[PDB]
Amino acid sequence: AQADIALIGLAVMGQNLILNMNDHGFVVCAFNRTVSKVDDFLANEAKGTKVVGAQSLKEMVSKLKKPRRIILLVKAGQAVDDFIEKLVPLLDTGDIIIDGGNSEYRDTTRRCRDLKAKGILFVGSGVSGGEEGARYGPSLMPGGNKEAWPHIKTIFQGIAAKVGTGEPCCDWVGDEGAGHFVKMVHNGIEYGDMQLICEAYHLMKDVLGMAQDEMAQAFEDWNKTELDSFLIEITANILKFQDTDGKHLLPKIRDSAGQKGTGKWTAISALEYGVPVTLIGEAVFARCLSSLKDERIQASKKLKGPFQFDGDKKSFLEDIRKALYASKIISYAQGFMLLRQAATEFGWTLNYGGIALMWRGGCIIRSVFLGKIKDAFDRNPELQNLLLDDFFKSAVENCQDSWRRAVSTGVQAGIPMPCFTTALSFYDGYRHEMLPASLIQAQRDYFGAHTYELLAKPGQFIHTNWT
Template structure:
């Protein structure tokens, strides 16, 4: 379809030959009165075209009972296309589009056609661009158009992915490596993002049965129904923009999977919006970075359970596997719960990274080189302290550039992408003291003020002494702080589960975090069994209680040594403060309540009688 002069007959004949079905030129079915009217330079109206369109529909119905057919027809308006598709079970509109100038030039060169070039503008005026059509620019060669159209029509793919950044590309390779034929899409931006998907497909032989697009409609049309489309785009407005662009091409029952770091409340909003249109939206946490996405990430889908069941074979296949060979992918729960636990995962990750950075900094103050620290931490990887983050820290410390270590050349300003902030805000909203996570976040914020810190060093210049501690004490303090960090993270997840009625399974969440993700560790492995056998919070588990009691003095000694030497260790300090606060029967909050009642009449409760009370603090 398309305006006169785009090459419908040329492409139609090529498609007919490639697919092996007959070709019919719609122009041949115009009654003589229509042809004479056009020859006279008069455009056809809807009444003129009605009988012609009905005859083409009758032709299509006849041919669908045989092998099918290719029909060239202008089909300019949506009403025309609706008439043409009546009683047709399977139909593709291949829309050929081009500029007025290019098509006009082509029409001037063709001979003996009843449609004069002078009527071209009337066709452009009538044209209503189709949403659900394979659309090709006539600047492509006829062979290119034909080959792409045949691929889409005859080679339906199983799964689609939008957004070929680092993670998107790795997930595409993962899917293809596991035998799935996929469709890949990346937007086209002149001089910035050109042929991204096409070039990526050409780079890897594993994509020989996969399809690449920068045309969204063709991308959607290339997939089996119900379509399963994964978004790997930046969180926030970009997700809404892609949904808005996708929506006109989708059908009832299609499934959109958001694999980015979206906020869980945005995910719920999108689920509710698309539910009204009978399109499923599955908010999915994905952790593992570039390597994990390629070799097997941890995957945390949530939303409609029936939609998850449709996509489970794909997600489970590409996920990492736990020690028992089960995929590190699980249906988390309803609404945005999958993105919520990915958010908390990242919060735990922030604190784990900060604790390792504090260990490194403390050891540097004792004069140890990065290589020496790497050897020490390397020995910890052979113990219950082993984790992915510990392993990569060892590798970082061993990396040299020239005669020195690369770590010494990296500016001490840490970035963040928002998930640590979201975790802290959510903890505050739910009233959960995830203080170690919050301290890790604010440590990054402090690091960002490099220029301010340099000025304050000059103002508050002081002689610093190296903190005095032994390695075993540091190791035990690190062990205790990690336990407290994980306790706070899972306590936050548990509170969210109750508040939002998600019914989350903490053991299953820990299990999918045992491999593929950034916080995978020996500690996480142990939590799977702890949560399986008891619903108690981590710091209430008998084995953990005994362990933390034996480690607390080491945590205290490290904090004391650091304070005495002016060494900043926000996460170690906060882990101890949290433990001290939670193991103190009577806190100073009674004074806070008295103050609140004094200036704001906020009332208070008493320890000696029930009820709420207010006092006239200046009265007799």
């Protein structure tokens, strides 16, 4: 038993994680269902390393130090269950299987429970950062049976991306499918951040009439602020990028972002669990709307809009920046509400501050802002909503006049801002003690005798004869 850990499946992600572990001094046993790929890997990408191969699952298991640790990176679904089924009879009580694939969190929960009953410790782990991240360090979001955590922590935190203060972006997420649930929400959050940047861009371009390189510089300047993030960095670079003919490339690109994307699952989850995650929902629907390109070409010939901007440009640009920041705060508050609800539904204990940290590092959504979210949970690990933390409360308060001006102006100009507007609507709803929803209750009681509750007596259902 000379190998520290094994990894099954030899596509690029798995190869790169293996090499990452190797570079950190761990002896890894590589395996693949088509075993010829093991030899190929050893002869090429793993040439000259400490990586060892196996020609069968039984041999692979035999090479592992106990408790045995086996990572699966294979196609999500049946392939994962089929490897689990083949592995169980070969393992010993206390051995550990980690699924690092793109798995659905309900499958992870099922596997965690079923394997626990068999004496096998199961971890589902989100992995973010793609092929390059896997190679030099991923964000890792492990959850599962926590009995496994002390055994995988050294390897997983060792290979993980680090932030600039040294903390690894990997920590135990929570029970059962929590790690994969967190990866799912991260995917939705990403849609929100990208759509928000698009709305800011649209306002710069069509309200302020800014040049491409001027908008690049605005985003660059913004990146020195509270907004400092990878997505803003690459946006600036994209905006200034010139094609071979000297013309900017971005204006040549088809604006259709797809109807089928994975971000939908976060919005669906929100609806299933009854959580108002409105911004990610609008971001998903905005991609869908963009995919309607031919329909929009036709509509643009038929349907009319409203306008000339007379104000101070620098001031309004700052208003857009603050609208973007405030809207982002609302989006993350919503995403964390979804995490909280899942915890309630399943009885999970979630590491909220750790999740914020894990979303830095290899993740596309990495930002200084995420460090502030970690700070909020570190100040108060019992924090119920991000909006109630003093930093975020102060931020929104300081941004809100700008936010309303940006939205009001965009509305007058006819610029679509589905995410800016949903975020503001949500903020205004959440902060109101009284909402008109009582009228919905009255309507349902009127037409269907559904009843209603009095403010003074919650939990007691009353029918009134309205007619």
